[PDB]
Design an enzyme around this catalytic site. Structure first.
Site, short mmCIF file in Angstrom:
data_model
loop_
_atom_site.label_atom_id
_atom_site.label_comp_id
_atom_site.label_asym_id
_atom_site.label_seq_id
_atom_site.Cartn_x
_atom_site.Cartn_y
_atom_site.Cartn_z
N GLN B 40 0.82 -1.24 0.00
CA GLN B 40 0.00 0.00 0.00
C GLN B 40 0.85 1.28 0.00
O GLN B 40 2.04 1.26 0.36
CB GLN B 40 -0.83 0.02 1.31
CG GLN B 40 -1.84 -1.08 1.43
CD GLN B 40 -2.36 -1.18 2.85
OE1 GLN B 40 -3.60 -0.97 3.06
NE2 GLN B 40 -1.47 -1.48 3.86
N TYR B 73 -13.18 5.31 17.02
CA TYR B 73 -13.32 4.03 16.34
C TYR B 73 -12.69 2.90 17.12
O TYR B 73 -13.24 1.82 17.19
CB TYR B 73 -12.64 4.18 15.00
CG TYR B 73 -12.57 2.98 14.13
CD1 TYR B 73 -13.58 2.71 13.23
CD2 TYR B 73 -11.41 2.18 14.12
CE1 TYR B 73 -13.50 1.62 12.37
CE2 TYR B 73 -11.28 1.13 13.28
CZ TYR B 73 -12.32 0.87 12.38
OH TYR B 73 -12.11 -0.21 11.57
N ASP B 98 -2.09 -0.52 13.49
CA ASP B 98 -1.76 0.64 14.28
C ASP B 98 -1.78 0.30 15.77
O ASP B 98 -1.14 1.02 16.57
CB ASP B 98 -2.70 1.83 14.00
CG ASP B 98 -4.11 1.42 13.93
OD1 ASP B 98 -4.60 1.20 15.01
OD2 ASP B 98 -4.66 1.15 12.83
N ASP B 149 -1.62 -11.96 5.35
CA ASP B 149 -2.97 -11.74 4.88
C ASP B 149 -3.99 -12.38 5.81
O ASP B 149 -3.93 -13.55 6.09
CB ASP B 149 -3.08 -12.39 3.49
CG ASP B 149 -4.37 -12.08 2.76
OD1 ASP B 149 -5.32 -11.41 3.27
OD2 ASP B 149 -4.51 -12.48 1.53
N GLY B 150 -4.97 -11.59 6.33
CA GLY B 150 -6.01 -12.21 7.17
C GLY B 150 -6.83 -13.28 6.50
O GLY B 150 -7.33 -14.16 7.15
N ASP B 168 -10.53 -5.03 11.40
CA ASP B 168 -10.29 -3.60 11.35
C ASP B 168 -9.47 -3.29 10.07
O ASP B 168 -8.25 -3.21 10.12
CB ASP B 168 -9.49 -3.13 12.65
CG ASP B 168 -9.03 -1.66 12.54
OD1 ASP B 168 -9.61 -0.95 11.66
OD2 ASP B 168 -8.16 -1.26 13.37
N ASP B 171 -10.47 0.11 3.24
CA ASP B 171 -11.63 0.00 2.31
C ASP B 171 -11.55 -1.20 1.31
O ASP B 171 -10.53 -1.88 1.20
CB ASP B 171 -11.80 1.39 1.60
CG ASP B 171 -12.06 2.60 2.60
OD1 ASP B 171 -12.87 2.46 3.55
OD2 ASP B 171 -11.45 3.69 2.45
N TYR B 237 -13.10 10.75 9.19
CA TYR B 237 -13.48 9.79 8.21
C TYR B 237 -14.45 10.42 7.23
O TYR B 237 -15.12 11.42 7.59
CB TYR B 237 -14.07 8.46 8.78
CG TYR B 237 -13.02 7.54 9.45
CD1 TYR B 237 -11.71 7.42 8.96
CD2 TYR B 237 -13.36 6.74 10.53
CE1 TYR B 237 -10.78 6.57 9.57
CE2 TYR B 237 -12.43 5.89 11.13
CZ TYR B 237 -11.15 5.80 10.63
OH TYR B 237 -10.27 4.92 11.34
C1 S4M Z 1 -4.76 1.02 9.51
S1 S4M Z 1 -6.07 -0.14 10.13
C2 S4M Z 1 -7.57 0.95 10.16
C3 S4M Z 1 -7.41 2.28 10.87
C4 S4M Z 1 -8.09 2.29 12.23
N1 S4M Z 1 -7.39 1.24 13.07
C5 S4M Z 1 -6.40 -0.97 8.55
C6 S4M Z 1 -5.40 -2.11 8.35
O1 S4M Z 1 -5.98 -3.06 7.41
C7 S4M Z 1 -4.80 -3.78 6.98
N2 S4M Z 1 -5.15 -4.75 5.92
C8 S4M Z 1 -5.55 -4.46 4.64
N3 S4M Z 1 -5.73 -5.56 3.98
C9 S4M Z 1 -5.48 -6.62 4.83
C10 S4M Z 1 -5.44 -7.99 4.67
N4 S4M Z 1 -5.79 -8.65 3.47
N5 S4M Z 1 -5.09 -8.73 5.74
C11 S4M Z 1 -4.75 -8.13 6.90
N6 S4M Z 1 -4.72 -6.80 7.13
C12 S4M Z 1 -5.07 -6.10 6.04
C13 S4M Z 1 -3.87 -2.62 6.51
O2 S4M Z 1 -2.46 -3.01 6.29
C14 S4M Z 1 -4.12 -1.62 7.64
O3 S4M Z 1 -3.00 -1.43 8.55
#
Ligand code: S4M
Ligand code: S4M
Lengths: 285, 294
Positions: B40, B73, B98, B149-150, B168, B171, B237
């Site tokens: 990203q 949030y 975070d 990856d989740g 969490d 988008d 947001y």
């Molecule tokens: C920053 S956090 C949201 C902000 C409020 N806590 C959103 C996180 O989603 C993660 N994200 C995005 N896609 C994935 C997947 N596929 N798996 C795990 N985490 C993910 C991304 O690296 C952000 O740090």
């Protein structure tokens, strides 16, 4: 201009809307009024600003107008006579006139050009202005309440611009003493109550002076408005009579014929508005 | 889509085709980080010190956290979910690099362990460097933080492992895309114990109503007994709010009324936004969106 960005800034933040076409942008006798159509790839529609501060948009206008109109009238046992100070766009007046109890509403806005431009560019906001239950006057609201009898109104709604411009005195205790006077014993007042993010100090000041001026109770109702600074605003809902809990609707709108035409407000949302974030909750005690 | 060109003439401007015709802007005092990671575009900046916002993080040009309002949030995700569960001992956070949601989850004396899996290790490293008040719990002994990856993590995790799963994410456009899909929610339902709860980053009622309705339907169709959206006030947001879908594996659970009120917990007074009145109020939606909840 078409393709540019209407940018609202007054610290280190701005909300901005893309412009498709500028319809009107001129000095009135009191304020700088701007009306434009925003980018049709977005949902906003037609936008009205005063002195650089967004006032209404087609897409979200219903929130503030429904919350002001119905939170106050559904807290009253039988609201027949209503005063709107400001409100020259007509939105609060459209909501108030949905109520079958209303016999008369006076609306007093200092700027006659807001009424004219709302009729030209916001027909769904301004339809109400011509209704024969309303008397629409051009004038200062502070002078108006000083000429008004004791015990005139069931509900007073103060739908004004911010404290910095022609609405300055409408956020002060002298004005609020007069609003308490012109209310009948069971009266309700609500206002453009500003933001818990940007104006917490002012909300605490006003809540306390309104109570101390003689209102029995004052509660702040929070609402979601995307195009107001930081995405919300509130209204202080005040009762002249002791023992009134404006946070539960006294006359629920669901018993009224127009409940299903509303886009925001209903009784669940009325009760929810008075729950405030912990940092702000002391406003409501 | 977006990266470094959103920082133009003194301001970060939150321009995105996921919300046409609008942009929240914050002014920039100093850029602290601005670079593509493995997944990203990560931007971190110090906003105007004359304003309240503090440090700001964005991913793929989408604002993720600011110092000033991050508590909202994180408190809502963490406490609405856990306060809906009878005894939440084992928790999974997908995303959340975070640390904010983890900080809140770890306030709970019931939690024995929380696993956190975020695709982007750079988000955790820069959170530790630039958001210490947010990332203060990443190294807690009750947490295990993994980079991956989740979607893979949930597929590998055995049935009946977690009491609460918090999704969490960013988008749906970028690396979170499949985390907004039915396949993934299947696995979340499977990895939950029978009385499990899940919640997610449930997007905006003003901009994503159609997506919220679609997720609500297929989460119910996967086998979750109930799905309710909680709305919250977040100035930075898009459109000034966001929500979470709070979902119960088991029937007969009313997630909208707290099962274990936080007021009976020793840390209730430490919170800046959440309490039980705010929990119950969050499920009341504007009339135009009320069909999401019934
Ligand atoms: C920053 S956090 C949201 C902000 C409020 N806590 C959103 C996180 O989603 C993660 N994200 C995005 N896609 C994935 C997947 N596929 N798996 C795990 N985490 C993910 C991304 O690296 C952000 O740090
Ligand atoms: C447009 S309305 C706000 C938009 C949501 N209905 C705010 C109005 O307050 C009026 N206003 C400002 N000052 C005063 C005073 N002193 N008196 C009456 N009305 C006033 C102003 O002319 C706007 O039309």
């Amino acid at each position: 201009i078409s393709g540019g960005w209407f940018r609202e800034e007054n610290p280190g933040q701005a909300m901005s809307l893309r412009v498709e076409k500028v319809l009107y942008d001129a000095p009135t006798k009191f304020q700088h009024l701007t009306i434009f159509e925003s980018d049709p790839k977005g949902p906003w529609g037609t936008v009205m600003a005063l002195d650089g501060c967004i006032q209404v948009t087609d897409y979200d206008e219903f929130v503030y107008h429904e919350v002001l109109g119905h939170t106050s009238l559904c807290s009253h046992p039988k609201p027949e006579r209503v005063l709107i100070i400001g409100g020259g766009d007509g939105g609060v007046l459209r909501e108030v006139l949905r109520h079958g109890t209303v016999e008369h509403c006076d609306l007093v806005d200092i700027d006659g050009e807001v009424m004219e431009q709302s009729k030209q560019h916001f027909p769904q906001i301004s339809r109400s202005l011509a209704d024969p239950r309303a008397t629409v006057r051009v004038g200062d609201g502070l002078a108006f309440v000083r000429q008004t009898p004791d015990n005139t109104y069931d509900v007073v709604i103060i739908d004004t611009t911010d404290p910095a411009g022609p609405a300055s005195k409408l956020f002060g205790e002298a004005f609020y003493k007069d609003v308490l006077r012109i209310l009948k014993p069971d009266g309700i007042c609500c206002n453009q109550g500003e933001s818990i993010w940007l104006d917490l100090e002012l909300i605490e000041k006003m809540s306390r002076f309104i109570r101390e001026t003689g209102f029995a109770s004052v509660q702040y109702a929070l609402m979601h408005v995307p195009t107001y600074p930081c995405g919300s605003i509130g209204t202080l809902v005040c009762s002249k009579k002791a023992g009134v809990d404006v946070t539960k609707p006294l006359r629920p709108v669901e018993d009224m014929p127009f409940a299903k035409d509303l886009k925001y407000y209903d009784s669940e949302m009325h009760k929810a508005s008075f729950a405030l974030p912990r940092f702000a909750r002391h406003i409501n005690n």
